[PDB]
């Protein structure tokens, strides 16, 4: 069981005032644990999981200072990118950043990330080697050259391989009773006649954690993809997730169509039919 920590941030310019909207969220695996919203009254990092509440005032002060600094960097960068791309002040633009790290079962570093987007498209990202950058265009390469000259990668790598992993380990221990759980999917099939020729089968997976799951159909033992539908995995709102997969079949031939459910919380995959 590997684990991840991720911070997601979004700054959106507001031409009418000049103060961007900044929203940052932190996750361990599929569980959110902190948020910051510049529109909120607190102007501080806020807890969103019970196991972060035990952190003292020094944690909240430092996290708030850091995230506010991040918001200010984004604010300056919105202006810089307007310059690089020759855009006017009239339109709203967006900077998004995702960063964080993965650890293995032994709690040791696996992978690190820092990826940036402008207006929903790649801008610049740290490569997997944590020593080089991928710029999407020549504007982003201005940034790349700046970060190369400043040796930013070595500083970021220290965070990703050090601070990020050690704090992920702390959170996993402090929240172990919920973060290190697996909730297996509860499964069932529904069935809806369409016509004298056709019927719908819908295979359900409910109440599972983490969110990763695979639902597949087979017809007479071979994977079936034609005439199928798969919805995005969705949050139930209580920390667990849901998903369904459907297939249109000849009426009366439902016995040929098996749904297969794979999830980390299942000892072996489940198969089910109407």
């Amino acid at each position: 069981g590997s684990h991840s920590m991720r911070y997601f941030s979004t700054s959106v310019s507001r031409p009418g005032s000049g103060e961007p909207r900044f929203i940052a969220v932190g996750y361990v695996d599929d569980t959110q644990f902190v948020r910051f919203d510049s529109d909120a009254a607190s102007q501080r990092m806020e807890p969103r999981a019970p196991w972060i509440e035990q952190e003292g005032p020094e944690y909240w002060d430092q996290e708030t200072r850091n995230v506010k600094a991040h918001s200010q960097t984004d604010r300056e960068n919105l202006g810089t990118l307007r310059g690089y791309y020759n855009q006017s002040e009239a339109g709203s633009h967006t900077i998004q950043i995702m960063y964080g790290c993965d650890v293995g079962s032994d709690g040791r570093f696996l992978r690190g990330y820092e990826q940036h987007a402008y207006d929903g498209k790649d801008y610049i990202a740290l490569n997997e080697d944590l020593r080089s950058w991928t710029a999407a265009d020549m504007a982003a390469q201005i940034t790349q050259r700046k970060w190369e000259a400043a040796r930013r990668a070595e500083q970021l790598r220290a965070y990703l391989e050090g601070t990020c992993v050690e704090w992920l380990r702390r959170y996993l221990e402090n929240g172990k009773e919920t973060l290190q759980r697996t909730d297996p999917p509860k499964t069932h099939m529904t069935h809806h006649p369409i016509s004298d020729h056709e019927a719908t089968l819908r295979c359900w997976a409910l109440g599972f954690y983490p969110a990763e799951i695979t639902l597949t159909w087979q017809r007479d033992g071979e994977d079936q993809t034609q005439d199928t539908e798969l919805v995005e995995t969705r949050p139930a709102g209580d920390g667990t997730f849901q998903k369904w997969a459907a297939v249109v079949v000849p009426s009366g031939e439902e016995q040929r169509y098996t749904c297969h459910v794979q999830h980390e919380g299942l000892p072996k995959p489940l198969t089910l039919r109407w």
Partner: peptide, 9 residues
């Protein structure tokens, strides 16, 4: 916990 700071583009 967060990065101490990000960087200017």
């Amino acid at each position: 916990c967060t990065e101490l700071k990000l960087s200017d583009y």
